[PDB]
């Protein structure tokens, strides 16, 4: 609603609405439909196969309003308005079609040949978001009318399986309406308004939010199994690749504090390839999904070692010791975050 259509976009909008409805009234005929009084699916009949004047005025209103909303959404996402050339837009191309698959109306079959334009993937992704917004509008209309999602289609319960998120949406109807709207956008560019796609947002939020507030869960062995001396080994297999920390923790480790931030835990962050004790320092390489990290501690000379799929991880220098010297204290127990 906040979008104000400039006058050039307005008088282009009128005849692009005309162009789209006539595109539709031969796409139905090439699908094989035929003109008729009532909108019957089995009879293969619709009054809309004819010019907009004799076409039902309510369907004309729908077509014009959806074209206006399409252009308004394109402007609302920030698509740069494109002008090819005034005489290029004044020039109109006609490509004749066979009568059986040609519209009953007198409009030109192909104002623009779908071939001679190489459509840039930037505005192709723009057409993607346009389809997503259009289906959002449709679903909003259904909710306003009171329709709700139901796996089996039922009109009397107003239950529709189509009411689903766009990514989860049915592939067949998805590609159908989606290619209809891609060819509509293709036509509006080919007519002369070669709209320039806006910038692509490379930055991603990466979905760091979690259920509830807690960001990590710490798993550790019992405090009674603390080792005071000797050589010990355990393995940590990363089913997924991501934010994990594994190592040895003191029996006083706090569940709410991240491993290695404090002084009471020694951890290895393979996701950042970084060690953790009273802070973080670069250590080793990163793991992939399915990698196994071996944790080796020798409590006699107070050293810790780490392995990634067998090979011993090493510092920025050639040293293989993850941590050089630490007091035995009250022992260490295996831990993972
Ligand atoms: N060529 C077209 N391209 C896109 N949308 C169109 C086109 N022609 C018509 N429409 C829209 O499709 C709508 C179809 O409405 P229809 O009567 O089929 O469904 P409905 O009344 O919501 O029924 P129900 O959802 O219960 O099946 C029309 O009202 C119009 O807004
Ligand atoms: C996708 O454009 C079209 C193509 C063909 C037809 C219509 C719309 C109009 N229809 C009503 C209709 C419209 C849209 C939907 C929908 O997909 O939500 C369902 C029914 C009657 C049969 S002719």
Swiss-Prot record:
Residue span, B30.2/SPRY domain: 156-337
Tissue: Detected in heart muscle (at protein level). Heart muscle, brain (cerebellum and hippocampus) and placenta.
Protein induction: By TGFB1.
Location in or out of the cell: Sarcoplasmic reticulum membrane
UniProt PTM comment: Channel activity is modulated by phosphorylation. Phosphorylation is increased in failing heart, leading to calcium leaks and increased cytoplasmic Ca(2+) levels.
Annotated Sequence repeat ranges: 1-97, 98-211
The family this protein is said to belong to: Belongs to the ryanodine receptor (TC 1.A.3.1) family. RYR2 subfamily.
Disease connection: Ventricular tachycardia, catecholaminergic polymorphic, 1, with or without atrial dysfunction and/or dilated cardiomyopathy: An arrhythmogenic disorder characterized by stress-induced, bidirectional ventricular tachycardia that may degenerate into cardiac arrest and cause sudden death. Patients present with recurrent syncope, seizures, or sudden death after physical activity or emotional stress. CPVT1 inheritance is autosomal dominant.
Assembly description: Homotetramer. Can also form heterotetramers with RYR1 and RYR3. Interacts with FKBP1A and FKBP1B; these interactions may stabilize the channel in its closed state and prevent Ca(2+) leaks. Interacts with CALM and S100A1; these interactions regulate channel activity. Identified in a complex composed of RYR2, FKBP1B, PKA catalytic subunit, PRKAR2A, AKAP6, and the protein phosphatases PP2A and PP1. Interacts directly with FKBP1B, PKA, PP1 and PP2A. Interacts with SELENON. In cardiac muscles, identified in a complex, composed of FSD2, CMYA5 and RYR2.
Function: Cytosolic calcium-activated calcium channel that mediates the release of Ca(2+) from the sarcoplasmic reticulum into the cytosol and thereby plays a key role in triggering cardiac muscle contraction. Aberrant channel activation can lead to cardiac arrhythmia. In cardiac myocytes, calcium release is triggered by increased Ca(2+) cytosolic levels due to activation of the L-type calcium channel CACNA1C. The calcium channel activity is modulated by formation of heterotetramers with RYR3. Required for cellular calcium ion homeostasis. Required for embryonic heart development.
Domain notes: The calcium release channel activity resides in the C-terminal region while the remaining part of the protein resides in the cytoplasm.
Protein name, per record: Ryanodine receptor 2
Organism in which the protein naturally occurs: Homo sapiens (Human)
């Amino acid at each position: 609603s906040q979008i104000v259509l400039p006058p050039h976009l307005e008088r282009i909008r009128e005849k692009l609405a005309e162009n789209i409805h006539e595109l539709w009234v031969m796409n139905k005929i090439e699908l094989g439909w035929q003109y008729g009084p009532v909108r019957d699916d089995n009879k293969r009949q619709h009054p809309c196969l004819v010019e907009f004047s004799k076409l039902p005025e309510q369907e004309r209103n729908y077509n014009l309003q959806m074209s206006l909303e399409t252009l308004k959404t394109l402007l609302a996402l920030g698509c740069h308005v494109g002008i090819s050339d005034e005489h290029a837009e004044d020039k109109v191309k006609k490509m004749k079609l066979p009568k059986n698959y040609q519209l009953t109306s007198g409009y030109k079959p192909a104002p623009m040949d779908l071939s001679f334009i190489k459509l840039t993937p930037s505005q192709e992704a723009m057409v993607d978001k346009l389809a997503e917004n259009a289906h959002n509008v449709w679903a909003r209309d259904r909710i306003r009318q009171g329709w709700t999602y139901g796996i089996q289609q039922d009109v009397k319960n107003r239950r529709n399986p189509r009411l689903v998120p766009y990514t989860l949406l049915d592939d067949r109807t998805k590609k159908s309406n989606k290619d209809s709207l891609r060819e509509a956008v293709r036509t509006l560019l080919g007519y002369g308004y070669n709209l320039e796609a806006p910038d692509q947002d490379h930055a991603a939020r990466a979905e760091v939010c979690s259920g509830t507030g807690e960001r990590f869960r710490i798993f550790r062995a019992e405090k009674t199994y603390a080792v005071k001396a000797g050589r010990w080994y355990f393995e940590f297999e990363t089913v997924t690749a991501g934010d994990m920390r594994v190592g040895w923790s003191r029996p006083g480790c706090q569940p709410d504090q991240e491993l290695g931030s404090d002084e009471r835990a020694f951890a290895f962050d393979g996701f950042k390839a970084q060690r953790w004790h009273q802070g973080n320092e670069h250590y080793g390489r990163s793991w992939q999904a399915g990698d196994v990290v071996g944790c080796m501690v020798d409590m006699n000379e107070h050293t810790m070692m780490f392995t990634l799929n067998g090979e011993i991880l090493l510092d920025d220098s050639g040293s293989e010791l993850a941590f050089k010297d630490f007091d035995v204290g009250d022992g260490f127990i295996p831990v993972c975050s």
